[PDB]
Amino acid sequence: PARGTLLTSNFLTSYTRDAISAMLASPEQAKCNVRVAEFTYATIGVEGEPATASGVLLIPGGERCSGPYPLLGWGHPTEALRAQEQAKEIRDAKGDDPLVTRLASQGYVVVGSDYLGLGKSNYAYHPYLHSASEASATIDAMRAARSVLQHLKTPLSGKVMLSGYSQGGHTAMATQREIEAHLSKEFHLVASAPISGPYALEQTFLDSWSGSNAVGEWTFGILLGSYAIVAMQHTYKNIYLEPGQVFQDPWAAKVEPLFPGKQSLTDMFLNDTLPSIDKVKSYFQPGFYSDFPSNPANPFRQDLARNNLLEWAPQTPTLLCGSSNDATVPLKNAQTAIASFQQRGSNQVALVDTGTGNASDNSAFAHMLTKESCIVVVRDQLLDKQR
Numbered sequence: 001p002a003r004g005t006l007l008t009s010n011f012l013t014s015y016t017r018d019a020i021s022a023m024l025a026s027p028e029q030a031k032c033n034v035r036v037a038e039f040t041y042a043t044i045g046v047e048g049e050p051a052t053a054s055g056v057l058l059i060p061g062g063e064r065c066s067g068p069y070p071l072l073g074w075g076h077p078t079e080a081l082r083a084q085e086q087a088k089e090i091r092d093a094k095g096d097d098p099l100v101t102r103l104a105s106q107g108y109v110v111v112g113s114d115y116l117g118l119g120k121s122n123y124a125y126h127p128y129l130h131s132a133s134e135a136s137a138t139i140d141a142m143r144a145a146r147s148v149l150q151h152l153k154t155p156l157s158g159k160v161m162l163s164g165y166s167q168g169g170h171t172a173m174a175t176q177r178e179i180e181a182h183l184s185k186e187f188h189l190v191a192s193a194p195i196s197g198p199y200a201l202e203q204t205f206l207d208s209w210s211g212s213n214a215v216g217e218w219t220f221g222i223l224l225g226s227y228a229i230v231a232m233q234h235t236y237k238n239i240y241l242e243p244g245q246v247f248q249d250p251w252a253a254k255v256e257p258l259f260p261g262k263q264s265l266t267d268m269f270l271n272d273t274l275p276s277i278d279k280v281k282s283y284f285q286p287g288f289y290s291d292f293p294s295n296p297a298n299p300f301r302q303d304l305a306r307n308n309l310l311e312w313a314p315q316t317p318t319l320l321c322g323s324s325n326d327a328t329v330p331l332k333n334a335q336t337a338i339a340s341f342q343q344r345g346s347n348q349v350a351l352v353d354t355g356t357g358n359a360s361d362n363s364a365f366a367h368m369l370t371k372e373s374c375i376v377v378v379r380d381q382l383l384d385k386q387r
Contacts, residue, residue, distance in 0.1 A: 001042035004143025004263035007052065009039040009151075013086055015095040017062050020105045023096050030105035030266070032060030034095065040120050041144030046133050048236050055113045055141040056087035057183035058104035060152055065107055065155045067155035070190075070387050072103065073142050074112035075164025075171030077371070080227065080268065082260035084127070085119040086112055095346045102379060107387075109149065109156065115171075117260060128231035129167060129176035130203060138175045139163075139183065161191040161383055165371045166329060169320075170347065173309045173337075180315050191211035192217020192318040192387035193378035196329045196370045199320075199337040203302040204330065209252075209293050211277045216327030219364030222267070222283060224328075226251075227259040232303040239299045246288045246300075249341040251275075310337055313346040319382040321374035324355035328367035333353045352377055 001007075013036050020030035037057040043050040060069060076086055090097045105111050117126030118132050127133040142160070149156060162179075163170030164165060172194040180185045198204040205225065208218035233239045243252035251274060258273065265363050268274060275283050291299050296305075320334040334351045354373045355361070 001331035003043055003142040006144040007042060009037060009148045012038055012091045013095070013376070015100060017064070017105070019215070020101055023101050023218060024088060029208050030101070032065035032105045032107055033062040034100050035059040035061060035105040036087060036100070037148065038085065038097070039148055042142055043047060043116070043140035044136050045123060047115065048126050051116060052120070052122045053113055053116060053137050053141065053358055054085060055111060055145065056090065057148060058099055058143050059149070059152070060107050060109065067270055068095050069107055069109045069155065070157050070159040070161055071142060071145070072108045072110050072161045072163060072383070073104060073138050073172075073175060074099065074110055074328040075112070075138060075168030075175070075215070076112055077166035077168050078128070078224065078227065078265060079118055079126070080258065081262070081264040081278045082118060084114070084264070086114055089146070095155070102372065102375045107123070108381070108383070109154065111142050113137040117171065117230050125234040126231060127235050128227050128259070129170055129198070129307055130235055131170070131177075131309060132170040132253045135173040135175040135178040138171060139178065139379075142187070143244045148364060158268075159190045159387065160187045161193070161386065163193040163195060163375070163378060163383070164197065165195040165374070166197065166367065168199065169194035170199065170309065172267055173197060174315060175317070176314065177309060177312055188328050189316045191382050191384055192314070192316045194320055195374040195378065196322040196326060196367060198329050198333050199309045200333045201308045201361050202301060203336060203354050204333060205304055206293055207330065207332070213327065213330055215325070216317065216362040217277060218330055219277055220269065221263055222280065223268055226255055227272065229300055229305070230259045231298055232254050236299070238303065246285055247300040248283060248285055253277075255299045271335040279377045292335055310340040311344070312341075314345070316348060316350045317382060318349040319352055319378050320349060321352045321354065321370070321378050323366050323370045323373070324353050324357070324363045325363060325366035325368060326355075327362055329363040352381060
């Protein structure tokens with residue numbers, strides 16, 4: 001089956017313009033009714049082998065919202081719950097989601113892949129922070145989405161845009177690079193707005209390895225680092241023969257089934273499935289813990305490096321958004337990327353900060369606040385302008 005082939009499609013629910021505006025009240029007003037659809041499609045694995053995936057499709061409509069519509073590919077954040085489907089999540093949230101309230105309701109067709117290994121995908125695991133598969137899944141999601149839209153006769157302007165939050169920011173940028181390098185004709189990319197992503201992936205881990213970074217305590221580091229380690233092992237299989245070489249007991253034996261698994265990241269954090277960051281030295285094996293920051297050839301580190309999104313020249317107008325208060329994914333990521341881009345001949349990438357400006361508001365928890373905050377900002381400062 002060709003990449004992007006639509007396997008199944010299905011409408012889930014709908015939301016009137018007024019319903020959405022009511023939600024916003026909780027003072028922006030919706031402009032479009034929003035139809036929520038779900039679908040599965042054919043794509044590829046990390047080795048290029050055939051694979052399936054699922055995705056969400058938000059279609060705007062209404063007398064005050066005639067097309068043509070721009071196509072926005074979206075990258076969701078870190079997801080540990082293997083069965084999680086964005087489309088059903090939105091439906092289960094009565095449509096109260098920024099993708100619906102802030103974008104689709106404003107005339108943007110939103111397409112998001114659940115990623116390999118999640119939702120209805122048939123992949124054995126999720127290649128967390130793996131640029132290539134984050135991009136392939138996203139690309140193929142838009143391809144399948146377009147078959148659906150073509151069948152529904154939804155008028156598309158032809159304009160394509162990208163955005164994503166947290167892991168989704170990495171995803172968004174990874175897709176941008178891929179499209180710009182090889183798919184400029186198929187996808188007329190006019191705007192890219194990665195939100196709070198670890199573009200300088202290797203750098204992010206190195207800076208917070210101790211348990212904290214210049215911004216604050218890397219509170220969720222044990223959950224994110226373990227997901228990254230496990231995922232990178234499944235993908236490159238060069239980190240360990242068995243979990244014990246990296247993780248101390250009794251974690252080693254329960255770490256792989258968790259990423260992804262029967263628990264959401266919030267479940268794990270609240271029920272302390274894994275130790276808190278202050279106990280990082282009690283979690284990782286001593287050898288591994290010290291070798292990582294001092295050996296660039298460390299396997300996990302090389303795997304992180306292969307997934308940095310720094311060595312290239314962005315062609316598409318890009319607005320990196322985040323918050324200086326973010327201690328989970330430091331806005332430093334945005335600064336390093338932009339620095340690398342410029343010395344490569346590109347001046348297409350700009351940065352926008354939504355922080356309070358007070359080092360006092362610094363918190364790993366400020367990360368979640370940037371999602372909807374940055375959606376509105378990048379939407380107004382870049383997306384609407386490139387429409």
